[PDB]
Scaffold this active site. Structure first.
Site, PDB file in Angstrom:
ATOM      1  N   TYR A   1       7.347  -7.088   9.287  1.00  0.00           N
ATOM      2  CA  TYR A   1       6.121  -7.311   8.506  1.00  0.00           C
ATOM      3  C   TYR A   1       4.986  -7.693   9.425  1.00  0.00           C
ATOM      4  O   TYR A   1       5.161  -8.480  10.332  1.00  0.00           O
ATOM      5  CB  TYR A   1       6.345  -8.441   7.497  1.00  0.00           C
ATOM      6  CG  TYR A   1       5.133  -8.902   6.740  1.00  0.00           C
ATOM      7  CD1 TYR A   1       4.354  -7.990   6.015  1.00  0.00           C
ATOM      8  CD2 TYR A   1       4.774 -10.234   6.715  1.00  0.00           C
ATOM      9  CE1 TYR A   1       3.257  -8.398   5.278  1.00  0.00           C
ATOM     10  CE2 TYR A   1       3.667 -10.666   5.970  1.00  0.00           C
ATOM     11  CZ  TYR A   1       2.921  -9.735   5.244  1.00  0.00           C
ATOM     12  OH  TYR A   1       1.827 -10.119   4.510  1.00  0.00           O
ATOM     13  N   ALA A   2       3.827  -7.086   9.240  1.00  0.00           N
ATOM     14  CA  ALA A   2       2.661  -7.439  10.054  1.00  0.00           C
ATOM     15  C   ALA A   2       1.613  -8.013   9.100  1.00  0.00           C
ATOM     16  O   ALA A   2       0.932  -7.262   8.385  1.00  0.00           O
ATOM     17  CB  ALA A   2       2.151  -6.205  10.800  1.00  0.00           C
TER      18      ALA A   2
ATOM     19  N   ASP B   1      -0.300  10.982  15.748  1.00  0.00           N
ATOM     20  CA  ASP B   1      -1.401  10.470  14.982  1.00  0.00           C
ATOM     21  C   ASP B   1      -1.693   9.041  15.396  1.00  0.00           C
ATOM     22  O   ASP B   1      -1.863   8.168  14.561  1.00  0.00           O
ATOM     23  CB  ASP B   1      -1.095  10.592  13.487  1.00  0.00           C
ATOM     24  CG  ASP B   1      -2.286  10.145  12.596  1.00  0.00           C
ATOM     25  OD1 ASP B   1      -3.430  10.348  12.991  1.00  0.00           O
ATOM     26  OD2 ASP B   1      -2.064   9.621  11.491  1.00  0.00           O
TER      27      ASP B   1
ATOM     28  N   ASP C   1       4.159   4.135  12.211  1.00  0.00           N
ATOM     29  CA  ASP C   1       4.315   5.496  11.706  1.00  0.00           C
ATOM     30  C   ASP C   1       4.536   6.465  12.819  1.00  0.00           C
ATOM     31  O   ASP C   1       4.006   7.577  12.786  1.00  0.00           O
ATOM     32  CB  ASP C   1       3.145   5.907  10.822  1.00  0.00           C
ATOM     33  CG  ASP C   1       3.157   5.171   9.494  1.00  0.00           C
ATOM     34  OD1 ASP C   1       4.064   4.340   9.264  1.00  0.00           O
ATOM     35  OD2 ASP C   1       2.259   5.408   8.678  1.00  0.00           O
TER      36      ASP C   1
ATOM     37  N   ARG D   1      -5.805   2.691  12.823  1.00  0.00           N
ATOM     38  CA  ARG D   1      -5.163   2.616  11.498  1.00  0.00           C
ATOM     39  C   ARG D   1      -3.617   2.568  11.581  1.00  0.00           C
ATOM     40  O   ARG D   1      -2.988   2.018  10.698  1.00  0.00           O
ATOM     41  CB  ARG D   1      -5.623   3.809  10.626  1.00  0.00           C
ATOM     42  N   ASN D   2      -3.018   3.176  12.620  1.00  0.00           N
ATOM     43  CA  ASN D   2      -1.591   3.179  12.859  1.00  0.00           C
ATOM     44  C   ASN D   2      -1.135   2.198  13.946  1.00  0.00           C
ATOM     45  O   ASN D   2      -0.122   2.410  14.645  1.00  0.00           O
ATOM     46  CB  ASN D   2      -1.087   4.569  13.135  1.00  0.00           C
ATOM     47  CG  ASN D   2      -1.212   5.484  11.934  1.00  0.00           C
ATOM     48  OD1 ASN D   2      -1.060   5.053  10.797  1.00  0.00           O
ATOM     49  ND2 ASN D   2      -1.523   6.750  12.180  1.00  0.00           N
TER      50      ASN D   2
ATOM     51  N   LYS E   1      10.078  -0.148   2.598  1.00  0.00           N
ATOM     52  CA  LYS E   1       9.627   1.144   2.117  1.00  0.00           C
ATOM     53  C   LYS E   1      10.653   1.744   1.183  1.00  0.00           C
ATOM     54  O   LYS E   1      11.864   1.682   1.450  1.00  0.00           O
ATOM     55  CB  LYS E   1       9.431   2.110   3.283  1.00  0.00           C
ATOM     56  CG  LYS E   1       8.605   3.357   2.944  1.00  0.00           C
ATOM     57  CD  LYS E   1       8.453   4.221   4.205  1.00  0.00           C
ATOM     58  CE  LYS E   1       7.181   5.034   4.226  1.00  0.00           C
ATOM     59  NZ  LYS E   1       7.110   5.785   5.505  1.00  0.00           N
TER      60      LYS E   1
ATOM     61  N   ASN F   1      -3.662  -3.571   9.302  1.00  0.00           N
ATOM     62  CA  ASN F   1      -3.872  -2.624  10.385  1.00  0.00           C
ATOM     63  C   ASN F   1      -5.025  -2.995  11.306  1.00  0.00           C
ATOM     64  O   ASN F   1      -5.917  -3.717  10.927  1.00  0.00           O
ATOM     65  CB  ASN F   1      -3.918  -1.167   9.916  1.00  0.00           C
ATOM     66  CG  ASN F   1      -5.210  -0.775   9.245  1.00  0.00           C
ATOM     67  OD1 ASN F   1      -6.310  -0.901   9.808  1.00  0.00           O
ATOM     68  ND2 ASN F   1      -5.079  -0.192   8.062  1.00  0.00           N
TER      69      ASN F   1
ATOM     70  N   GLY G   1       0.790  -1.255   0.000  1.00  0.00           N
ATOM     71  CA  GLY G   1       0.000   0.000   0.000  1.00  0.00           C
ATOM     72  C   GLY G   1       0.811   1.289   0.000  1.00  0.00           C
ATOM     73  O   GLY G   1       2.040   1.230  -0.063  1.00  0.00           O
TER      74      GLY G   1
END
Ligand SMILES: COc1cc(OC)c(Cl)c(N2Cc3cnc(Nc4ccccc4)nc3N([C@H]3CCN(C(=O)/C=C/CN(C)C)C3)C2=O)c1Cl
Length: 265
Positions: A94-95, A141, A159, A145-146, A45, A99, A21
Site C-alpha cells: 500500500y502506498a 508506460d 503497473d 502517474r505510475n 486488486k 501517485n 480507484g
C-alpha cells in the site's frame, strides 16, 4: 484456479476497506506468519462487476509475473493472494500518499519539497527501473502517474507487469519497446518531477508530436531545474536509442547529484 501456498492468504484474514480507484485499501491480519496478531495495511486488486474472461486472465498474468520478478524496495511488491473461497484478490504493498504526479501537484507553491527531495525522488524511481531492467522487465508506460509514494515517501514503480507523450519515438511509430524506450520515458518523468507534475508538451496536439519529435523538437528546460539535470533529460531523449544512458548509469549519476545537492536549496 490452482492454489499456490507460497502466496495464499486465507480470505477471512483480509478486512476490506475503501476503494482506492479495481483496487481497495484493506487490512491483512497475520500476513507475517511470524507476527500473527499484527494487522498490515495492504492494497488489494480484484475484478470489476461487469468483467470479461480477458480481464480475469490478465489479472492472473499480472500476478504470476509479479511472483517471478522478486522484491525491490522501489517497486510495488506482491504480498499474497486469495484465490480459493471466491473471487480472486491480489494483495500488494500500500502506498498511502498516492501517485507521484498528484503528490507533486499538491506540493506546488501541502508542504514544499526541497531540491534535494526532488532529486532523491528521481534517484529512487531510477533504482526501481534499474531493478526491473536487470530482471529483463520492460515497463512500457513509465510516468509519474505510475510511481506511488508510501507513508515514508519511498517511491515505488507501479503497473510494471502489464500517454503517447511518454513514448519514445521508436515506440510511438513502430511499437518497438525496449529498455531504451523506458529510459526515454524516464526523461519525461524527470521533466514531470522538476515541473512539479507539469503536463508534457503543453498545447501540442497528439497527432503532430511524432513529426515534431522526428524533427528534433524537445521540451524546454523547466524554469527551476539545473542545467545538469536538463542535460540528463536531453540524454534520455537521444534520437538514437543506443546513445541514451542506461538506468544503471542514471542511478550512478543521480546518486552523485543527490550527494552534492544540500538539504537547503
Ligand atoms: C496487482 O495489484 C496491483 C499491482 C500494481 O503494480 C504492479 C499496483 Cl501499482 C497496484 N496498485 C497498488 C496501489 C498501492 N497504493 C495505492 N495508494 C493510493 C491510491 C490512490 C489514492 C491514495 C493512495 N494505490 C495502488 N493502486 C492504484 C489505486 C489507484 N491509484 C492511483 O494512483 C489513483 C489516482 C487517482 N487519484 C485521484 C486518487 C494507484 C494500484 O493499482 C496493484 Cl493493486
Amino acid at each position: 484456479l490452482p492454489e499456490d501456498p507460497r502466496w495464499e492468504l486465507p480470505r477471512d484474514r483480509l478486512v476490506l476497506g475503501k476503494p482506492l480507484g479495481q483496487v481497495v485499501l484493506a487490512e491483512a491480519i497475520g500476513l507475517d506468519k511470524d507476527k500473527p496478531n499484527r494487522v498490515t495495511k495492504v492494497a488489494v486488486k480484484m475484478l470489476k462487476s461487469d468483467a470479461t474472461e480477458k480481464d480475469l486472465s490478465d489479472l492472473i498474468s499480472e500476478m504470476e509475473m509479479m511472483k517471478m520478478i522478486g522484491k525491490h524496495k522501489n517497486i510495488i511488491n506482491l504480498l499474497g493472494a486469495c484465490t480459493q473461497d471466491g473471487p480472486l484478490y491480489v494483495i500488494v504493498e500500500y502506498a498511502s500518499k498516492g501517485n507521484l504526479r498528484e503528490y507533486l501537484q499538491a506540493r506546488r507553491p501541502e508542504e514544499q519539497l526541497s531540491s534535494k527531495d526532488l532529486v532523491s525522488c528521481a534517484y529512487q524511481v531510477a533504482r526501481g527501473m534499474e531493478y526491473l531492467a536487470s530482471k529483463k522487465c520492460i515497463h512500457r508506460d513509465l510516468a509519474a502517474r505510475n510511481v506511488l509514494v508510501t507513508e515514508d515517501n519511498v517511491m515505488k514503480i507501479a503497473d510494471f507487469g502489464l500517454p503517447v507523450k511518454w513514448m519514445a519515438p521508436e515506440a510511438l511509430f513502430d511499437r518497438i519497446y525496449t529498455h531504451q524506450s523506458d529510459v526515454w520515458s524516464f526523461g519525461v518523468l524527470l521533466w514531470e518531477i522538476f515541473t512539479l507534475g507539469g503536463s508534457p508538451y503543453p498545447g501540442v496536439p497528439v497527432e503532430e508530436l511524432f513529426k515534431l519529435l522526428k524533427e528534433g523538437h524537445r521540451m524546454d528546460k523547466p524554469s527551476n531545474c539545473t542545467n545538469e539535470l536538463y542535460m540528463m533529460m536531453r540524454d534520455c531523449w537521444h534520437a538514437v536509442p543506443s546513445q541514451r544512458p542506461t538506468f544503471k548509469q542514471l542511478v550512478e549519476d543521480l546518486d552523485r547529484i543527490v550527494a552534492l545537492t544540500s538539504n537547503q536549496e
